[PDB]
Amino acid sequence: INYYKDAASSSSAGQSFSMDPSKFTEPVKDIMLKGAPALN
Amino acid sequence: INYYKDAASSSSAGQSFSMDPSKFTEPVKDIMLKGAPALN
Amino acid sequence: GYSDRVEQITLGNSTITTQEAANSIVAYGEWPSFLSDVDASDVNKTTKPDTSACRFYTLDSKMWTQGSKGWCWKLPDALKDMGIFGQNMFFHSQGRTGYTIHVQCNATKFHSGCLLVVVIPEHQLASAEGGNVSVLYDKTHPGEKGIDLSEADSTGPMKDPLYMMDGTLIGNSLIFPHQFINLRTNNTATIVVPYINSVPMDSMTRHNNLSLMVIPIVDITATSGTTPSIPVTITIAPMFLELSGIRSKAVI
Amino acid sequence: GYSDRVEQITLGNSTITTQEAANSIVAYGEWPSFLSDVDASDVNKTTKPDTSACRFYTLDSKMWTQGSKGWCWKLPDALKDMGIFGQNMFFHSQGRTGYTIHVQCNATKFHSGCLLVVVIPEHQLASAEGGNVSVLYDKTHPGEKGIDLSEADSTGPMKDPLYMMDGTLIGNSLIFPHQFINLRTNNTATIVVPYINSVPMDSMTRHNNLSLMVIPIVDITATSGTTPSIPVTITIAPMFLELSGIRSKAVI
Amino acid sequence: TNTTGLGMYRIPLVQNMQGEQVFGFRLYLGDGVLKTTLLGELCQYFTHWAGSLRLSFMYTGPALSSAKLLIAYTPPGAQGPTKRKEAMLGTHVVWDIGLQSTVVLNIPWTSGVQYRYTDPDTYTSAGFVSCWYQTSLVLPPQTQQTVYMLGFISACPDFKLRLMKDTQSIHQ
Amino acid sequence: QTLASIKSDSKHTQKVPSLTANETGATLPTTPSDSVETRTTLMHYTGSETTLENFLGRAACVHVVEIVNKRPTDTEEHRMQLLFNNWKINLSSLVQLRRKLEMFTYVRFDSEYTIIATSSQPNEAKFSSNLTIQAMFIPPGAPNPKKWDDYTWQSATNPSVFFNVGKSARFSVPYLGIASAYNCFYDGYSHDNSTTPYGINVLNHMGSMAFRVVNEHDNHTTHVKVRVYHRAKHIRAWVPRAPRALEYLHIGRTNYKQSPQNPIKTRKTISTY
Amino acid sequence: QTLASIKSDSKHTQKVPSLTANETGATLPTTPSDSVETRTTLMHYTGSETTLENFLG
Numbered sequence A, B: 001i002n003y004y005k006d007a008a009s010s011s012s013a014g015q016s017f018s019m020d021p022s023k024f025t026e027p028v029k030d031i032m033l034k035g036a037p038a039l040n
Numbered sequence C, D: 001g002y003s004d005r006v007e008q009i010t011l012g013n014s015t016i017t018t019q020e021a022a023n024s025i026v027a028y029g030e031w032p033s034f035l036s037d038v039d040a041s042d043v044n045k046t047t048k049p050d051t052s053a054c055r056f057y058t059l060d061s062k063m064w065t066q067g068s069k070g071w072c073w074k075l076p077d078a079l080k081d082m083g084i085f086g087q088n089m090f091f092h093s094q095g096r097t098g099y100t101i102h103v104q105c106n107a108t109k110f111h112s113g114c115l116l117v118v119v120i121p122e123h124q125l126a127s128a129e130g131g132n133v134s135v136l137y138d139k140t141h142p143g144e145k146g147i148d149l150s151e152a153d154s155t156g157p158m159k160d161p162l163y164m165m166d167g168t169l170i171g172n173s174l175i176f177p178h179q180f181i182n183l184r185t186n187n188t189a190t191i192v193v194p195y196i197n198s199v200p201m202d203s204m205t206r207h208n209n210l211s212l213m214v215i216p217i218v219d220i221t222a223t224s225g226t227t228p229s230i231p232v233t234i235t236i237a238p239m240f241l242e243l244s245g246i247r248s249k250a251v252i
Numbered sequence E: 001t002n003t004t005g006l007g008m009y010r011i012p013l014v015q016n017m018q019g020e021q022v023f024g025f026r027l028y029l030g031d032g033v034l035k036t037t038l039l040g041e042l043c044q045y046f047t048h049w050a051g052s053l054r055l056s057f058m059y060t061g062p063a064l065s066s067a068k069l070l071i072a073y074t075p076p077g078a079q080g081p082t083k084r085k086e087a088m089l090g091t092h093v094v095w096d097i098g099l100q101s102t103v104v105l106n107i108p109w110t111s112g113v114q115y116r117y118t119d120p121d122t123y124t125s126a127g128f129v130s131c132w133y134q135t136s137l138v139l140p141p142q143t144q145q146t147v148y149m150l151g152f153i154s155a156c157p158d159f160k161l162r163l164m165k166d167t168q169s170i171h172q
Numbered sequence F: 001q002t003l004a005s006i007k008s009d010s011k012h013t014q015k016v017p018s019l020t021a022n023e024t025g026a027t028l029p030t031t032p033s034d035s036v037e038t039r040t041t042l043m044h045y046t047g048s049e050t051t052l053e054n055f056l057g058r059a060a061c062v063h064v065v066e067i068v069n070k071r072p073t074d075t076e077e078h079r080m081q082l083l084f085n086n087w088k089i090n091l092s093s094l095v096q097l098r099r100k101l102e103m104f105t106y107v108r109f110d111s112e113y114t115i116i117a118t119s120s121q122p123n124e125a126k127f128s129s130n131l132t133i134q135a136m137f138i139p140p141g142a143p144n145p146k147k148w149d150d151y152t153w154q155s156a157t158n159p160s161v162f163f164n165v166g167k168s169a170r171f172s173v174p175y176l177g178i179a180s181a182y183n184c185f186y187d188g189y190s191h192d193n194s195t196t197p198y199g200i201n202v203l204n205h206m207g208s209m210a211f212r213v214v215n216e217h218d219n220h221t222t223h224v225k226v227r228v229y230h231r232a233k234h235i236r237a238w239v240p241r242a243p244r245a246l247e248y249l250h251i252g253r254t255n256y257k258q259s260p261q262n263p264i265k266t267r268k269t270i271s272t273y
Numbered sequence G: 001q002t003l004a005s006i007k008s009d010s011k012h013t014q015k016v017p018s019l020t021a022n023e024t025g026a027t028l029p030t031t032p033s034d035s036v037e038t039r040t041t042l043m044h045y046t047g048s049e050t051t052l053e054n055f056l057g
């Protein structure tokens, strides 16, 4: 229950989210597949 | 009512359970019966 | 009549046959088994030596005579030098075992006496020097030769069976899986023990699971004749040996 | 593009990765497998060490230089001292194996030369003394150190590669599973060999199956510079190791 | 010592050497060679570490050169390795230098304990990592050079961290 | 409702529940009705009071530290001056708690802490001051405070609590074990070596808790004792064992005196009442 | 529940997940099962403890 109507007052509520490491691990135009040559 | 969303914060809730002394009193492969010879 | 006093145990390529035995014990009511996917945390295909390891091994017998204090063996340490099991123990980074522990002691109707056979998990030992002194590796891992409580030492663990080896009283050691051998009734005791630990699998070299105590409660006597001497023989087998991770042979 | 020149082999807890390789060979067109009930004659539950044994082992490399005659290894003998496999070999009365045999030899585009890698079953050897002389056990079971055909002896087998080691000509050794390593094209050769014998299972100590020959056909040369020296490394793994019968460790 | 500069990130390989060790280290995510890597820095904010690690090596020598290297992981309880014959008994990969310049070795979780400490602690030692010359480094005829590899580290998808703590990277 | 006993009359049977063999290691669940004539009666008891949860889930003092508020002296390490204090986490320091935990081989639980501080001024004081006390967790790998007010105390990532003398802190800490349960005993070593610590101490990498007075010196020296209480919650335990009869000597170790007193009261005759 | 690893047996394929190029700047999501034989096992972890919210909050 929220007791204040000013949203900053809200406790640190939130959900866990699925991770998306592709933004940092596979930022490539052409999709690389495991097992395929990296250098074609 | 729980006021915290971190489960460790929960009070010592729980149910009573039926006892199972057989784990400590009758750990035998071959079932012994009261009134039967222990040594057959 | 399939009398409860007569049993045959077949395990791997070895057997045990008894005619005067008490019902075997399954420690804590749980038969030994393999690690489930749910419990497992180690991401390696495991190794299952099967019947090449899961067979009976016999440890050197010891004489039980008047004045004997009793003996102690550590598992898996006791088997470290025996068969393929002993070799696997030093190549595999971790593993888990269950055991079948069988203790034998023959006598005639003219003998009296009583052994208490107890399997104690995590039997942390008190040092002979007390204080802040720890028991050295060399004295907690003797292999086939158990810790003879009848032998003097000053660097080993305390040997007085009244207090076991840890300050508890022997009278209450019966909380642990145990069985008695009364020479007048039975010459064997058998205990089956599941893997018991806080982790799925563990080192088989830096840590013991089970400590097998054989302590005479009533001295061996006889209706007539000189002090008797009766050998006590211990036979132990792995049940569901499961190993993981390959490394060069460990050096101790 | 899944080029045939690039392969990965994963076996047990070990891998091999190659970029310049010829298609691997499956000897006689048959992939290694376990003994069937129909073929089996030994009435014992078998032991299957699985991935504790079926992994790659690497033998000491040898230098290939001008004048080298070639080398010979015996299986399973070569692995007798390696890992749990080596230990199992002396506890089990009989067994059967298949192998993955991988031979490596690096070079640059400026090198020339050619190795012939051949796997020969039952390669009975001729003695250096000829006549009625047999080759002694000590000289047919050298372990990791293969038989270096470049070394002199008088008690060992004959070492002249033209006649292999048995009176046949090397030119016709190509009837056996084989693969070449041309330094200009490929740096590896891989041969997979099923268990081949007249019996279901056999001793792994008094009898060899497979004899791995690595014989240079064309000497290593280079477009320029001094005589080159290129190491040759051999990596071997059991495929479907199956063992039976437990005995005390064999003494050789 | 005496490697001031970017030289610390370069692993030398030399000609005509065979069976010798290229490198080796004790596998800590605390005070080892991994201390300053991102896993190092992230792990220094946590007490408990679990899951698999990934090592990767990239060859930066001449296109005409070649070598085979053995990369191995030695599980806890073992010593060394000091010889290739020991290293080969652990978890290992043989790496062929060629067009694809990078090898990836995923170090499996082999612990009998569900979590290990990020701080060095004998009870939860992760064992060792080592690399040996499977064959040797070969360069074009009549040349003599030292070539280098670059080592990399990252976590596997199966990577876990628990219980946050302050690092020891702050001195004021 | 569960019956304690059921009516049972005189028997003359070949079935003999009073005769067995302890040799088997089993304790058969015999009743008074198997020996004597009995009358039907209820238990009026559920056994809830004896649940493991009540046995272990009560607050107990675990450790007491002493810290002071004084003008720092530049000739001595601040820790030695008791300007702050470090408690290595354990439950084995005080026997009243240790003894209960010792009765199980493997124990799993969440913790609840209570920290209570009391001040004292054993000197020629002019007034009393209510000091603010800081308690901070320092898990393995975390920096250990060196000065009474160095950067470590910023508690950027380390859980911490501030409370006043006369007040108390309370918080929960979830099961922190690496394994599925805390080991009470460990029959082994940290590694395969001849010389190394033996026993449960090798598993105790819980870290430390640091205490500090966050106020500056105030003319006189003020002594603060901080008492830490612990209560287990959601408790599970496995493999029960015999309780210790002999006195404890040290933490972790199961050592005992060279010539212990036999903890069994004696009497003149086996038949003396 | 999310698996940490899946059972995987010895391979002898032309597909080579252990061989790549960091030159590309990509880190491929390879697993232990792409190197060694593995056994199916669960993670029993959600990663909630490592959320940005706990790191900074």
Ligand SMILES: Nc1nc(-c2ccccc2)nc2[nH]nc(Nc3ccc(C(F)(F)F)cc3)c12
Pocket: C198, E113, F089, F090, F091, F111, F177, F178, F179, F181, F182, F183, F184, F185, F200, F203, F204, F205, F206
């Ligand atoms: N730290 C430990 N680790 C392990 C263990 C580690 C690895 C594998 C298996 C077991 N077992 C232990 N048993 N007693 C321990 N000490 C302890 C536990 C909790 C707390 C407190 F107070 F924080 F809850 C204070 C002290 C302990």
